[PDB]
Ligand binder design. Sequence first.
Ligand SMILES: [Cl-]
Ligand SMILES: [Cl-]
Length: 61
Amino acid sequence: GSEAIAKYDFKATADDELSFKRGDILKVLNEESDQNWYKAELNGKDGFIPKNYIEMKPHPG
Ligand SMILES: [Cl-]
Ligand SMILES: [Cl-]
């Protein structure tokens, strides 16, 4: 899994989507995907998140 920070509030509008707030750290499950939706987990929930809403955690420095 890879961490990513939410850059905007996102509200799920389908049952398979995962809501989150700006600042939340999501765990992205299939970062290697070339799709514009990722699968992620946050605070015990999971679902699809939009790729362009998040910033992947880089290596420090
Ligand atoms: Cl949700
Ligand atoms: Cl590190």
